[PDB]
């Protein structure tokens, strides 16, 4: 009836998608072959008899990561034409992603998206999964975003983004890419949900007692959040919130469209037994900084909009009480121009857990989407990083080689300065 298209871009995107789709299959009882022995239809199309296919597109500029999908356990789950690969990667270069390499495959991917949309009766919109730092995750994604807006426009577009950490980071050019993708995507995205690998690692270590978390674990954790976000569409609840809702409730000004995700409770079978995981307790957990999924200081910022999506054995009154308590607490501050800061969703289905996963089975969970002036701090460090490197024109030649002009960098800088100014000004 109402349907959601998922796009998985680059390595990070693809891997996250693998997790998410697996989780979905588990939740709806769909086998890795597409068979199941009817709300799941919002995510899966139906073909012929006893086969269900994800409404998804997987894109990467190199074949290696997607080749694992096409040879792996869920090879029969996806239709071959929706797994799209080029030959040469974007090599951590935004320009290769956006221009040189990306312009060769973008049309094809658009066609597939259009075809997917043809089978939709009530298209809600798109969920795009991608990194800010990779050449494809940045450059290709920006290209794709812009294109989507032209073709569609009024339909809602949502981003899930692996935001780079302050200390831990893999790429050397990551700041350049992050700034540039931010500049180019800003006017084309309605809402972008950031998360941070450092934060997820810490949570895994501290809350789940995992000595050595792997990327798989992180992906699994992400999947849960995604499930929480889309459970309102994939099940029927008491009081529920669609994809069209978020953009209106979380974005007070068009450019300030970066709310952050927090999930609770994330605990092993050791610490699950020795706790009464009540609604108040889980809710409270979400507003303490150690459990949040982006490394950043909310205590040093102010909340502007907060959306709480509850799942499982949860009753409205207790949620309300919890919210009241949170409001009362002086250390959790909301900006003065927003007296009503909460948007609340409640869904009946408890979180389903992947066999062999790190998480214990719980009666209740919550996913908070929160928009905070604390993101300004994060932006600032990134800006500073950009500034240093550009001062020496370090790596700039590579970008130029792929058709980018120096002036573009300047423009990007300017736009980020503007953004940070805006963020500051909202605060006061």
């Amino acid at each position: 009836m109402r349907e959601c298209i998922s796009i998985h871009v680059g390595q990070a995107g693809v891997q996250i998608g693998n997790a998410c789709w697996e989780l979905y299959c588990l939740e709806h009882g769909i086998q890795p072959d597409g068979q199941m022995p009817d709300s799941f239809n919002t995510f899966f199309s139906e073909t012929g008899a006893g086969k269900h296919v994800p409404r998804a597109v997987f894109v990467d500029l190199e074949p290696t990561v997607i080749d694992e999908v096409r040879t792996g356990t869920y090879r029969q789950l996806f239709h071959p034409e929706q797994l799209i690969t080029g030959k040469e990667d974007a090599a951590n270069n935004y320009a290769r992603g956006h221009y040189t390499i990306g312009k060769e495959i973008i049309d094809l991917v658009l066609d597939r998206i259009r075809k997917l949309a043809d089978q939709c009766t009530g298209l809600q919109g798109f969920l795009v999964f991608h990194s800010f730092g990779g050449g494809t995750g940045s450059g290709f994604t920006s290209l794709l975003m812009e294109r989507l807006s032209v073709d569609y426009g009024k339909k809602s577009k949502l981003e899930f983004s692996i935001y780079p950490a302050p200390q831990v980071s893999t790429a050397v050019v990551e700041p350049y890419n992050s700034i540039l993708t931010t500049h180019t995507t800003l006017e084309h995205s309605d809402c972008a949900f950031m998360v941070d690998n450092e934060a997820i690692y810490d949570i895994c270590r501290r809350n789940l007692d995992i000595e050595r978390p792997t990327y798989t674990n992180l992906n699994r954790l992400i999947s849960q959040i995604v499930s929480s976000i889309t459970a309102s569409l994939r099940f029927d609840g008491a009081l529920n919130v669609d994809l069209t809702e978020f953009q209106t409730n979380l974005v007070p000004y068009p450019r300030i469209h970066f709310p952050l995700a927090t999930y609770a409770p994330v605990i092993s079978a050791e610490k699950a037994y020795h706790e009464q995981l009540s609604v108040a307790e889980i809710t409270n957990a979400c507003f303490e900084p150690a459990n949040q999924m982006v490394k950043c200081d909310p205590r040093h910022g102010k909340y502007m909009a907060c959306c709480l999506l509850y799942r499982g054995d949860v009753v409205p009154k207790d949620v309300n009480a919890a919210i009241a308590t949170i409001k009362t607490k002086r250390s959790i501050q909301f900006v003065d121009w927003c007296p009503t800061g909460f948007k609340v969703g409640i869904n009946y289905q408890p979180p389903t857990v992947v066999p062999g996963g790190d998480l214990a089975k719980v009666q209740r969970a919550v996913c908070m989407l929160s928009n905070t002036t604390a993101i300004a701090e994060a932006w600032a460090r990134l800006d500073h990083k950009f500034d240093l490197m550009y001062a020496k024109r370090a790596f700039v030649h590579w970008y130029v080689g792929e058709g980018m002009e120096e002036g573009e960098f300047s423009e990007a800088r300017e736009d980020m300065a503007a953004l940070e100014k805006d963020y500051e000004e909202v605060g006061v």
Partner: protein, 426 residues
Amino acid sequence: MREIVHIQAGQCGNQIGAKFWEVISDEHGIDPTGSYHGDSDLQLERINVYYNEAAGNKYVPRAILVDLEPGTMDSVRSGPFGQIFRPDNFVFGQSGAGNNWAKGHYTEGAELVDSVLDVVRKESESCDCLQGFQLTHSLGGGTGSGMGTLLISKIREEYPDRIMNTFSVVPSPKVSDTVVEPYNATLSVHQLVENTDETYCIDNEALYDICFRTLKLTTPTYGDLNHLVSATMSGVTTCLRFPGQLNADLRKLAVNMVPFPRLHFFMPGFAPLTSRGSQQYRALTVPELTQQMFDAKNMMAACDPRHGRYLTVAAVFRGRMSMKEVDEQMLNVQNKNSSYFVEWIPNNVKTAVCDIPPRGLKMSATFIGNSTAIQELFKRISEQFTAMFRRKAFLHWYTGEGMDEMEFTEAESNMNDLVSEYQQYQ
């Protein structure tokens, strides 16, 4: 002889509405298939007020179900009593409104409204003499608020001489369930003041309180909350559906309770309400009922009636009762609490009695208060709205749908005016 047409808009509207319908069915002895399996002839005598007879001794609600999303509709159809509804009376969009009043009123709702209007017209034209319309919805969402409001206006244009009733669940004081709630509420109110004859102000906070403190309910459900609302609604139309000693229908109540056209926002209340344990330790007499009625803890609006004055109170009693006792008690309460009643309307209380009590009970009461304390609610919303507008927060979501700033200003002005008027009388 007289007929009522029911409209349900958005999620909240639909969910309350279903419950209400169930209640009505139970009362009139009609099962989830539409067939009458009652016993008392009184249950069927005025069944035409809410039900059309669709042949084969089967009855169907004169009910129109509207939403911009189909999910709610699906949920309803699959529910207990989902099968009694006429399939062609479910009118649904595909997009949704995303808690945006603009979408409900000007965009998505606009596209769909014609169909619903047509359906309503059809319903009216089959019924011999429509008393009027009852709309259930929230003011805080996009569909119930924006589209519901639109529907009201359109209905009024066609049927300017018919009574327009709303059961509106309004934004609570403590906790907000949407961020843009004040906008949605405010705009809704703007249209409501001009286009409805009366609005019953239901507050979820108050319902929760009632559930916790009076009903002793550890874990209240939204269903339970809705039940109370449904009961109130049933109480309000009892004189249309059953005999009595003194009868008052929707028009009678309205004229008794609305002294000036704009002041038609009621605080409804229902009595009695007891726990499973505390059922034994009190007698079922009129005094107890009266006490329950005139008490802040039993009001379904989050406002303290002792912070204002009652302009008018309508009390509707169900069961076999001594009228003398009722008269005395209403007098007595007024005498006692003289300071909470406006001095320039002598005999502030209107009384009605229906012989048929609700099922499972010997005696029941429904209270409608028109209290100047309602101003508080309006004030709180108004302030919030003003604050939001000061920073132009979220405005592009509404202006993007074609709305202009001027409209917002107008809405604000109306809101302020209403509160001023309330203050003047106080």
